[PDB]
Amino acid sequence: VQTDPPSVPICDLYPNGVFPKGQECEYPPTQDGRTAAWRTTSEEKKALDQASEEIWNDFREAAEAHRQVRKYVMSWIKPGMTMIEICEKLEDCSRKLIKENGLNAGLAFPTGCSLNNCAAHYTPNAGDTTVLQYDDICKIDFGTHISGRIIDCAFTVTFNPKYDTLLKAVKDATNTGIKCAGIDVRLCDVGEAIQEVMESYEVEIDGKTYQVKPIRNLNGHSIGQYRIHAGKTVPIVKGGEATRMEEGEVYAIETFGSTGKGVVHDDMECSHYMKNFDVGHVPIRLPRTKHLLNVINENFGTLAFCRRWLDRLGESKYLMALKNLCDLGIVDPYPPLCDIKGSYTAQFEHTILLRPTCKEVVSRGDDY
Amino acid sequence: KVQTDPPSVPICDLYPNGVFPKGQECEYPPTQDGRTAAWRTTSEEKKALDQASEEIWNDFREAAEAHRQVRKYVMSWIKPGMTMIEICEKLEDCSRKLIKENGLNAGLAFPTGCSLNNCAAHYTPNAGDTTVLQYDDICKIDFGTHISGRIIDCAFTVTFNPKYDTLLKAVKDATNTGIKCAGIDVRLCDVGEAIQEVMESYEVEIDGKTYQVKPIRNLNGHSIGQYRIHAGKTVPIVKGGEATRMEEGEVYAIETFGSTGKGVVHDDMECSHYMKNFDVGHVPIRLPRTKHLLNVINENFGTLAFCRRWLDRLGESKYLMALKNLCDLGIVDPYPPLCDIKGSYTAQFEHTILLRPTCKEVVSRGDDY
Ligand SMILES: *C[C@@]1(O)CC[C@@H](OC(=O)N[C@H]2CC[C@H](N)CC2)[C@@H](OC)[C@@H]1[C@@]1(C)O[C@H]1CC=C(C)C
Ligand SMILES: *C[C@@]1(O)CC[C@@H](OC(=O)N[C@H]2CC[C@H](N)CC2)[C@@H](OC)[C@@H]1[C@@]1(C)O[C@H]1CC=C(C)C
Numbered sequence: 068v069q070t071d072p073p074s075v076p077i078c079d080l081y082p083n084g085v086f087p088k089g090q091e092c093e094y095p096p097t098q099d100g101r102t103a104a105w106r107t108t109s110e111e112k113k114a115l116d117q118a119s120e121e122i123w124n125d126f127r128e129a130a131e132a133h134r135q136v137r138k139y140v141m142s143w144i145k146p147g148m149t150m151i152e153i154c155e156k157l158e159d160c161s162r163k164l165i166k167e168n169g170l171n172a173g174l175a176f177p178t179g180c181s182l183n184n185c186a187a188h189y190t191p192n193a194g195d196t197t198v199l200q201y202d203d204i205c206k207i208d209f210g211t212h213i214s215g216r217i218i219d220c221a222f223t224v225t226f227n228p229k230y231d232t233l234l235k236a237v238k239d240a241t242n243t244g245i246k247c248a249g250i251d252v253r254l255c256d257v258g259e260a261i262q263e264v265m266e267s268y269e270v271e272i273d274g275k276t277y278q279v280k281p282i283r284n285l286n287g288h289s290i291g292q293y294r295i296h297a298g299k300t301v302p303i304v305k306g307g308e309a310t311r312m313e314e315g316e317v318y319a320i321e322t323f324g325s326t327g328k329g330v331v332h333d334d335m336e337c338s339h340y341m342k343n344f345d346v347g348h349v350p351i352r353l354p355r356t357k358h359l360l361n362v363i364n365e366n367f368g369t370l371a372f373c374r375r376w377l378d379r380l381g382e383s384k385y386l387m388a389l390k391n392l393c394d395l396g397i398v399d400p401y402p403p404l405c406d407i408k409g410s411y412t413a414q415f416e417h418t419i420l421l422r423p424t425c426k427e428v429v430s431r432g433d434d435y
Numbered sequence: 436k437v438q439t440d441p442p443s444v445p446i447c448d449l450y451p452n453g454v455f456p457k458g459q460e461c462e463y464p465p466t467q468d469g470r471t472a473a474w475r476t477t478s479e480e481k482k483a484l485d486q487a488s489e490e491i492w493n494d495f496r497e498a499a500e501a502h503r504q505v506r507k508y509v510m511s512w513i514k515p516g517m518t519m520i521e522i523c524e525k526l527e528d529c530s531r532k533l534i535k536e537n538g539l540n541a542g543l544a545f546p547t548g549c550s551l552n553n554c555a556a557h558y559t560p561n562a563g564d565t566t567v568l569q570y571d572d573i574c575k576i577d578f579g580t581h582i583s584g585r586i587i588d589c590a591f592t593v594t595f596n597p598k599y600d601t602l603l604k605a606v607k608d609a610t611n612t613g614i615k616c617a618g619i620d621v622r623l624c625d626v627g628e629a630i631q632e633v634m635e636s637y638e639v640e641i642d643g644k645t646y647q648v649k650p651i652r653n654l655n656g657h658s659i660g661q662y663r664i665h666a667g668k669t670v671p672i673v674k675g676g677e678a679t680r681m682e683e684g685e686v687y688a689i690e691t692f693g694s695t696g697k698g699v700v701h702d703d704m705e706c707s708h709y710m711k712n713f714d715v716g717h718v719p720i721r722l723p724r725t726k727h728l729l730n731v732i733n734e735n736f737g738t739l740a741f742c743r744r745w746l747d748r749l750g751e752s753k754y755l756m757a758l759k760n761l762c763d764l765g766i767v768d769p770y771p772p773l774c775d776i777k778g779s780y781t782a783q784f785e786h787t788i789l790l791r792p793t794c795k796e797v798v799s800r801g802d803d804y
């Protein structure tokens with residue numbers, strides 16, 4: 068049985084390391100209006116599903132860790148904690164529940180805790196004195212992996228009830244996206260469905276009424292092994308690509324709602340970085356740059372990381388080396404993404420598997 | 436009194452004054468503040484605490500000397516073409532003689548592991564197993580001895596094909612690294628970190644494919660207590676294991692497992708290994724055959740691990756339903772073979788260490804490993 072606080076690894080909580088299934092769903096009709104209810108009992112597909120069970124079960128492990136960590140977080144997170152203390156406490160728990168081991172099992176990406184008008188890609192760097200406040204709207208977006216099978220899953224934390232209708236709107240939009248996803252479904256059609264739900268909500272906050280806007284330049288995304296962004300984008304507005312979702316793909320279905328302009332730009336200090344896949348052996352002159360790349364290779368590979376995570380490894384005076392890797396195309400920065408000052412943004416996100424026999428919301432909990 | 440070839444003289448008769456050989460003794464690693472632990476070596480207070488437990492250390496050392504002599508003998512004859520049953524019976528017959536087996540007073544601490552290939556741990560043949568050791572096999576010989584419930588848990592990997600040499604080197608280095616990192620007040624996950632750093636640093640090319648050597652993340656070393664092979668602390672072989680600290684006077688099995696596969700094990704094949712749980716002390720029993728099987732386990736094994744071959748040789752038959760019964764009642768636990776993916780290769784090295792007041796003793800160290 069799990070400790071309180073959690074300390075027992077998921078791999079030791081389940082007989083023979085067979086982990087709980089998420090929500091399983093029949094596929095929605097395609098554009099032609101056909102149901103694929105045949106998948107459910109097709110023997111071809113049942114076999115094809117079983118053939119990748121090892122993969123689905125790894126996703127499930129990482130999903131169960133996600134659920135336990137987030138319930139733990141949901142038991143202590145409060146105003147007056149530093150964002151640093153929040154992320155450290157969450158991440159400490161994640162490492163223990165996933166029984167982290169270098170690139171074999173671990174944290175898939177930094178703990179997002181984006182506040183207020185900032186929608187995504189904020190985590191504190193060293194020295195950040197930001198404190199979580201009663202009237203903050205905080206997007207907790209964190210990830211776990213087993214063998215590079217990533218869970219990307221997120222929710223919004225608040226303490227003031229005035230944000231309740233905003234959270235309801237985005238939760239609805241995300242659940243709509245999840246319901247509309249399936250094999251042979253066009254990516255644009257998911258985006259259209261999300262937008263029509265999102266935009267049906269108007270919220271009143273501090274005596275002002277706002278039209279809930281989808282953040283039009285934020286997206287969900289396909290996931291591949293060690294590759295958080297595998298190259299298909301899931302729009303959250305109408306008019307995305309006609310590309311179809313395909314059997315065996317894995318998607319992060321996420322939506323963002325704003326009371327602001329409904330669009331993000333780069334803002335505040337960068338915390339998040341990630342080595343690029345495509346890039347080959349670009350030559351490196353400087354010792355500090357070579358060293359930083361070795362630390363990145365050993366600890367992260369192609370997974371996202373943050374400055375705090377380099378600090379905790381004993382790295383120092385690495386910022387110009389990090390800039391050097393960025394300039395060389397070896398690493399990309401991912402700065403915080405913000406709507407206008409004074410706006411409010413909310414997010415919900417799950418990871419779904421497009422298994423040959425059903426759609427699995429592998430990260431679904433009793434919470435969201 | 437000198438040892439025969441094959442070995443036949445009990446260790447207790449080979450050292451007729453009853454004082455058995457020390458293992459490798461080592462100074463403790465520096466504390467996390469960077470300070471030396473060398474004061475323990477010459478501390479009068481630590482020397483006295485050490486000597487108050489000399490009876491205990493000395494019983495481990497007789498068990499360790501038996502282990503050394505058995506495994507040397509095993510290495511002199513183990514070869515392809517022998518059955519796994521032949522290997523285990525030959526090993527076990529020697530172990531019994533050298534330890535001077537007598538009930539729970541002295542004996543075999545647990546069944547002879549001889550896990551093959553993708554199987555990492557907890558395989559021993561049952562009756563009727565026709566498995567033959569092959570040139571291409573990678574075999575983990577993991578066997579234990581005890582004197583008065585002072586257990587030696589110690590293991591090595593047997594191969595005949597040089598293609599596995601680099602995997603064996605990685606795992607031995609990892610184990611030796613773990614042994615070196617161990618000490619009083621050291622966190623168990625820090626031992627795991629040192630180990631994982633060593634395994635990470637190896638790649639092996641087998642059958643034309645290059646593999647990253649992975650620690651088996653869901654396997655651990657463990658603390659040892661009297662007649663208690665797993666005394667409740669785990670020594671992870673990865674960073675992400677428990678933060679709990681090692682303590683003075685504890686005994687650990689420091690073992691590492693390396694894999695070319697996923698780095699994770701699952702249950703597979705027929706279960707051979709079983710062991711009575713420590714606390715289940717008056718869970719009442721209604722079926723006679725079950726009550727008899729328990730009596731036999733109590734008399735012969737107590738809380739030490741056993742296997743089905745060791746019930747067979749006691750003249751017990753038709754007991755699988757009763758053993759399942761003891762399992763279902765929570766009196767006994769099964770320990771099925773633990774195996775990475777088909778076609779993967781797993782290796783292991785293990786030693787027993789004593790966290791003595793004055794020094795760390797690698798009690799089961801030999802000239803072999
Ligand atoms: C971090 C991420 O998941 C947030 C949602 C997605 O972000 C976008 O849609 N990003 C942009 C694109 C450029 C634009 N000027 C502004 C908005 C998602 O990308 C689809 C993000 C993700 C997966 O890129 C990753 C990297 C992962 C991490 C840095 C943790
Ligand atoms: C036999 C044993 O020494 C092999 C190494 C250890 O095994 C594990 O760590 N097993 C895991 C496997 C996954 C599971 N979720 C949790 C346990 C070791 O355990 C520490 C094993 C040992 C000591 O369990 C004992 C029993 C001893 C015998 C059966 C001989």
Ligand SMILES: [Mn+2]
Binds near residue numbers: 219
């Ligand atoms: Mn996310």
Ligand SMILES: [Mn+2]
Binds near residue numbers: 321
């Ligand atoms: Mn995402």
Ligand SMILES: [Mn+2]
Binds near residue numbers: 577
């Ligand atoms: Mn062992």
Ligand SMILES: [Mn+2]
Binds near residue numbers: 588656688690
């Ligand atoms: Mn052991």
